[PDB]
């Protein structure tokens, strides 16, 4: 397959397990997600030293399309090759009931 620098690897109707590509000068990573075309977004951050490059986004609505963005937080003057924000789209599945 073609490499995917941001992807969902596990999903439930109300939760998503995203995986992304890390970079050496990243202090940590910021995760922005919200309904595609929605009026509000949520931002969270990973912890320093966490090199797992994985995170769980939870509390989502079933059957709704979300825009997930991951970017590397760096120190000013210590960014170098850090590419910047990458985004994907993912529509959650319906619930069993």
């Amino acid at each position: 397959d073609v490499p995917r620098d941001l992807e969902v690897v596990a999903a439930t109707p109300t939760s998503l397990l995203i995986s992304w590509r890390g970079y050496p000068w990243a202090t940590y990573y910021g995760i922005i997600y919200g309904e595609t075309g929605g009026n509000s977004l949520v931002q969270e951050f990973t912890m320093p030293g966490d090199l797992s490059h994985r995170a769980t986004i939870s509390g989502l609505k079933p059957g709704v399309d979300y825009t997930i963005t991951v970017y590397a937080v760096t120190r000013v003057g210590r960014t170098f090759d850090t590419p910047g924000p990458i985004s994907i789209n993912y529509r959650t599945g319906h619930h069993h009931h």
Binding site: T27, R75, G77, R78
Partner: protein, 129 residues
């Protein structure tokens, strides 16, 4: 205050940072060199509104409180101003809490790209201790 290299090695060894969580003393000398250049008053902005303070560049979103970072956790429970003192006692105690948080010294970007996997003992070669 800008520490000397050997001066800082002895000060951090007095604080018991040698082999703390398996990290020999040379790791901490090298980490301070590429994070702050041995300057106790080093301050650097991040791109998320946070700031790194002190000789070990302790982050103001996760560890210390600087009163200006949104959603700061302050897991070290200490004002960031205390990490700008010429006395590195506060920065060492917070560094021990960070390295024991399960990720080791990988929390310091400069240590990862400049010290990890190198001859870190070169940074203590020729010092008193």
């Amino acid at each position: 205050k800008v520490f000397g290299r050997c001066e800082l090695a002895a000060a951090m060894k007095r604080h018991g940072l040698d082999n703390y969580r398996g990290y020999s003393l040379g790791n901490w000398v090298c980490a301070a060199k590429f994070e702050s250049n041995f300057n106790t008053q080093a301050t650097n902005r991040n791109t998320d509104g946070s700031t790194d303070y002190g000789i070990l560049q302790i982050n103001s979103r996760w560890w210390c409180n600087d009163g200006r970072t949104p959603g700061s956790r302050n897991l070290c429970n200490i004002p960031c101003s205390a990490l700008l003192s010429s006395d590195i006692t506060a920065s060492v105690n917070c560094a021990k809490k960070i390295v024991s948080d399960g990720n080791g010294m990988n929390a310091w970007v400069a240590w990862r790209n400049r010290c990890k996997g190198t001859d870190v003992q070169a940074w203590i070669r020729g010092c008193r201790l």
